[PDB]
Design an enzyme around this catalytic site. Structure first.
Site, mmCIF file in Angstrom:
data_model
loop_
_atom_site.group_PDB
_atom_site.id
_atom_site.type_symbol
_atom_site.label_atom_id
_atom_site.label_comp_id
_atom_site.label_asym_id
_atom_site.label_seq_id
_atom_site.Cartn_x
_atom_site.Cartn_y
_atom_site.Cartn_z
ATOM 1 N N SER A 170 0.736 -1.252 0.000
ATOM 2 C CA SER A 170 0.000 0.000 0.000
ATOM 3 C C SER A 170 0.777 1.321 0.000
ATOM 4 O O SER A 170 0.138 2.365 -0.200
ATOM 5 C CB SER A 170 -0.959 0.002 1.196
ATOM 6 O OG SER A 170 -1.724 1.189 1.238
ATOM 7 N N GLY A 171 2.087 1.342 0.158
ATOM 8 C CA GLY A 171 2.666 2.619 -0.227
ATOM 9 C C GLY A 171 3.577 2.958 -1.405
ATOM 10 O O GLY A 171 3.089 3.119 -2.522
ATOM 11 N N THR A 175 2.948 1.838 -5.877
ATOM 12 C CA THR A 175 2.701 2.867 -6.871
ATOM 13 C C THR A 175 3.841 2.958 -7.862
ATOM 14 O O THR A 175 3.610 3.092 -9.066
ATOM 15 C CB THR A 175 2.492 4.207 -6.179
ATOM 16 O OG1 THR A 175 1.603 4.035 -5.070
ATOM 17 C CG2 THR A 175 1.904 5.210 -7.153
ATOM 18 N N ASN A 221 -0.318 2.212 8.785
ATOM 19 C CA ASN A 221 0.045 2.794 7.492
ATOM 20 C C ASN A 221 -0.446 4.224 7.356
ATOM 21 O O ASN A 221 -1.524 4.582 7.827
ATOM 22 C CB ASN A 221 -0.546 2.016 6.301
ATOM 23 C CG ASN A 221 0.110 0.681 6.062
ATOM 24 O OD1 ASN A 221 1.332 0.556 6.117
ATOM 25 N ND2 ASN A 221 -0.701 -0.336 5.805
ATOM 26 N N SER A 224 -2.513 5.609 2.470
ATOM 27 C CA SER A 224 -3.079 4.316 2.137
ATOM 28 C C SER A 224 -4.526 4.598 1.798
ATOM 29 O O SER A 224 -5.179 5.366 2.499
ATOM 30 C CB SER A 224 -2.951 3.335 3.306
ATOM 31 O OG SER A 224 -3.547 3.868 4.477
ATOM 32 N N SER A 225 -5.032 4.001 0.731
ATOM 33 C CA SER A 225 -6.158 4.639 0.077
ATOM 34 C C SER A 225 -7.361 3.745 -0.120
ATOM 35 O O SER A 225 -7.254 2.648 -0.677
ATOM 36 C CB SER A 225 -5.731 5.159 -1.283
ATOM 37 O OG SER A 225 -5.041 4.158 -2.007
ATOM 38 N N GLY A 447 -7.463 -5.324 -0.419
ATOM 39 C CA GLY A 447 -6.904 -4.755 0.792
ATOM 40 C C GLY A 447 -7.397 -5.378 2.077
ATOM 41 O O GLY A 447 -8.564 -5.235 2.451
ATOM 42 N N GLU A 449 -5.877 -5.543 6.149
ATOM 43 C CA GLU A 449 -4.886 -5.277 7.179
ATOM 44 C C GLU A 449 -5.482 -5.628 8.531
ATOM 45 O O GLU A 449 -6.690 -5.833 8.667
ATOM 46 C CB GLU A 449 -4.433 -3.811 7.170
ATOM 47 C CG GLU A 449 -3.817 -3.336 5.861
ATOM 48 C CD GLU A 449 -4.858 -3.064 4.789
ATOM 49 O OE1 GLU A 449 -5.935 -2.533 5.130
ATOM 50 O OE2 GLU A 449 -4.604 -3.391 3.612
#
Length: 749
Positions: A170-171, A175, A221, A224-225, A447, A449
């Protein structure tokens, strides 16, 4: 040298595998800084075993943490996919050996698994990238470039669509590698033909604003989107490249509802609400203080050092790069300003009467101004609504809760809408009268977590994640059955998609778990405890994989305990039921449609009304799933092995759990039953002839099958340990292990 790690030696491959080794020595032991370390049997005991560790101490361990390990032949292979011993540490340490080899690209399923290298390497440099398409999987060095490559040639002939699916991470690396993915799309363009933002740079046009737009902060995190984005790319061309979509998928409205004091809000808000832009703040009818807006305030009051003055400037940079008008876009974020103003709105309940009733408030007047409504219009027409058609009739007296929920719902929906609008023009900037026939796609997140503490929505997304894993599993199920067909062999295995779908089915009957929760929310003025009790009757006896959570540390109460592909995870209740509640009113947008701003038409525009809300979120996923069913999917799972993103070394434990979250681990659990294994005649026999001590001529006097039947006649008769394949040979994981165990033992003697 080129690809210097990526295929590392002929000589060394041999010589490493040449190196002295013994399995029955080389064992598993459990560690404080790895969950497990490679080990030696000192001695063995009833339900404990006596052990020493390569780096460290002698160690005393129970049986169950232990087996002797797949030897140097296995040790230098490309593939988790071709495992020959199944316990997690094997996989993990071995890939760690890749990592100390720095050897990049890792394979399981039929597909490749990824780590941010945290360092310079010219992985990109075209010598590999251009000069070859490359090869199907077995044939070439592992690379994500492969997955694209073969997905192309697959689709090229196949000419229906495929997407490639990339998990967690996620970071930064997530990307970065998505970028590089489109970079390789550019390489595909170069492959197809060759002779205006650059197309990656075109995605970058989206990126900074959208990144602020739907990023969120996890306890574990920090950007994180929690939108749903999906990325599509579209071909009227099989030439150089044709143009692409990024698309609209599950968005998490509830985050606007709530935060904990550790936690913060949709980043847009946090960003804008910083101090820097002197005119807007009052133009916004806003105080620079977050502190005011309690509904905003619910979170943590800053992130120390993410610098929102510059991030504001970046937002400007993008919105200007839009080539779209200041006045609209300012009004648009101003909408969000109104939204946070709604947190102030608070109503009051009169004598001899149940209604909730107004605080007469500058807040409402700000709304009126920004909307180009009048406030009284709100006051009467909403605050006691009208709905009827065929005659027309009015709605009055809402509870405090009814009001509060209702307005929050409206605000949230409006935020949602605003996101939705972003599609129209942003894509149109992307969008082209160059045709599309066919499609290849990208997704960012399955996703899941963990927190010690939990809230429903997150669990719901986790549900969706495992659903994605259903999709993974049953596709593999089908394909692998085709591989049974491939060399003549008949299926002894049943749908993995179904099998774990049953685990979802505990969540899902025509009764949904979610469904009954939100459903019963219409039973009023009652308490989650009621449902607790309904759990305890309904599931707690019945539904095996769900559990009353045990006692454990960290938490006042936890209420649900259930079993997942990631492992088994346990979660807790605050009375939040109403948070999922969706109120509706026509009237609100109904009149906004009148209003001046001319955002409002796209603002504005049977299955349900004011209801079904989590099921709506199912619906949103559901359509996506349906459409994906058409496709061929492709797969990438992605990791921070390190404490950090650094050249600095492994941090194990989260990598453990990520891999638990990254299907390959229990996917390989699933597959080991397969005896999921194919090994080629010629190499294999080129080792194995030794015990037969038999001369009958090469060629087909003996098949490999015959030579097997003879050596097996000395060694084994089995299905489970082995069966024949028509060109390649099939085994229990253990079996190769014992084969070479025999080979060293016999050749040494």
């Amino acid at each position: 040298e080129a690809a210097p790690y990526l295929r590392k030696s002929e000589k060394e491959r041999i010589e490493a595998q040449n190196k002295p080794f013994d399995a029955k020595s080389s064992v598993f032991v459990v560690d404080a800084k790895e969950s497990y370390v490679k080990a030696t049997v000192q001695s063995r005991e009833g339900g404990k075993v006596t052990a020493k560790t390569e780096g460290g101490a002698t160690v005393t361990v129970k049986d169950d943490q232990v087996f002797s390990m797949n030897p140097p032949k296995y040790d230098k292979i490309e593939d988790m996919a071709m495992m020959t011993h199944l316990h997690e540490p094997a996989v993990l340490y071995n890939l760690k050996e890749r990592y100390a080899a720095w050897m990049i690209y890792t394979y399981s399923g039929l597909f490749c698994v990824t780590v941010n290298p945290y360092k310079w390497l010219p992985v990109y440099n075209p010598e590999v990238v251009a000069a070859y398409r490359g090869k199907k999987r077995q044939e070439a060095p592992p690379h994500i470039f492969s997955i694209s490559d073969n997905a192309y040639q697959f689709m090229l002939t196949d000419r229906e669509n495929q997407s490639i699916l990339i998990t967690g991470e996620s970071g930064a690396g997530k990307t970065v590698n998505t970028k590089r993915v489109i970079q390789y799309f550019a390489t595909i363009a170069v492959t197809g033909d060759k002779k205006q933002g650059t197309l990656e740079d075109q995605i970058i046009s989206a990126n900074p604003l959208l990144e602020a737009f739907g990023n969120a902060k996890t306890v574990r995190n920090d950007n994180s989107s929690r939108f749903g984005k999906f990325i599509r790319i579209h071909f009227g061309a099989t030439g150089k490249l044709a143009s692409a979509d990024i698309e609209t998928y599950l968005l998490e409205k509830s985050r606007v509802t709530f935060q904990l004091k550790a936690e913060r809000s949709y980043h847009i808000f946090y960003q804008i609400m910083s101090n820097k832009k002197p005119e807007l703040i009052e133009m916004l009818l806003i105080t620079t203080n977050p502190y005011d807006f309690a509904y905003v305030s619910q979170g943590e009051i800053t992130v120390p050092s993410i610098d929102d003055q510059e991030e504001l400037m970046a937002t400007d940079t993008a919105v200007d790069i839009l080539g779209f008008s200041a006045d609209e876009k300012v009004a648009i974020y101003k909408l969000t300003g109104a939204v946070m103003h709604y947190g102030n709105m608070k109503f009051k309940q009169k004598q001899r009467e149940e209604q909730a009733e107004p605080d007469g408030t500058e807040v409402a007047d700000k709304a009126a101004y920004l909307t180009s409504l009048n406030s009284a219009d709100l006051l009467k027409a909403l605050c006691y609504p009208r709905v009827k058609v065929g005659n027309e009739y009015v709605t009055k007296g809402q509870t405090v809760q009814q009001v509060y929920n209702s307005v929050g719902a409206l605000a949230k929906s409006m935020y949602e809408k605003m996101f939705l609008w972003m599609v129209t023009r942003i894509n149109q900037q992307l969008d082209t009268k160059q045709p599309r026939q066919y499609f290849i796609g990208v997704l960012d997140i399955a996703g899941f977590e963990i927190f010690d503490f939990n809230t429903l929505e997150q669990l719901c997304i986790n549900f969706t994640n495992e659903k994605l894993q259903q999709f993974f599993n049953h596709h593999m199920f089908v394909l692998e059955q085709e591989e049974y067909k491939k060399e003549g062999i008949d299926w002894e295995f049943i749908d993995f998609g179904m099998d774990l779908a049953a685990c979802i089915e505990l969540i899902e009957k025509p009764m949904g778990i979610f469904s009954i929760l939100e459903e019963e929310c219409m039973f009023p003025k009652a308490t989650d405890t009621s449902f607790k009790n309904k759990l305890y009757e309904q599931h707690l006896g019945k539904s095996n994989n769900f559990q009353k959570p045990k006692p454990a540390k960290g938490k006042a109460e936890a209420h649900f305990s259930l079993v997942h592909y990631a492992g088994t995870v346990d979660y807790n209740i605050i009375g939040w039921l109403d948070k999922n509640k969706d109120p509706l009113n026509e009237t609100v947008v109904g009149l906004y449609q009148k209003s001046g701003l001319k955002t409002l038409a796209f603002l504005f525009s049977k299955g349900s009304s004011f209801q079904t809300v989590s099921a709506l979120f199912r619906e949103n996923l559901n359509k996506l799933m349906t459409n994906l069913k058409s496709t061929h999917p492709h797969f990438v799972r992605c990791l921070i092995p390190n404490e950090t993103k650094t050249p600095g070394a492994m941090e194990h434990e989260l990598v453990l759990h990520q891999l638990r979250c990254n299907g390959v681990l229990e996917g390989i659990r699933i597959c080991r039953k397969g005896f999921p294994s194919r090994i080629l005649y010629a190499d294999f026999k080129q080792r194995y002839k030794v015990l037969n001590a038999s001369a009958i001529p090469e060629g087909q006097f003996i098949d490999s099958k015959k030579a097997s039947e003879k050596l097996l006649g000395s060694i084994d008769i089995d299905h489970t340990q082995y069966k024949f394949g028509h060109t390649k040979v099939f085994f229990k994981a253990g079996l190769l292990g014992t084969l070479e165990e025999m080979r060293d033992e016999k050749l040494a003697q």
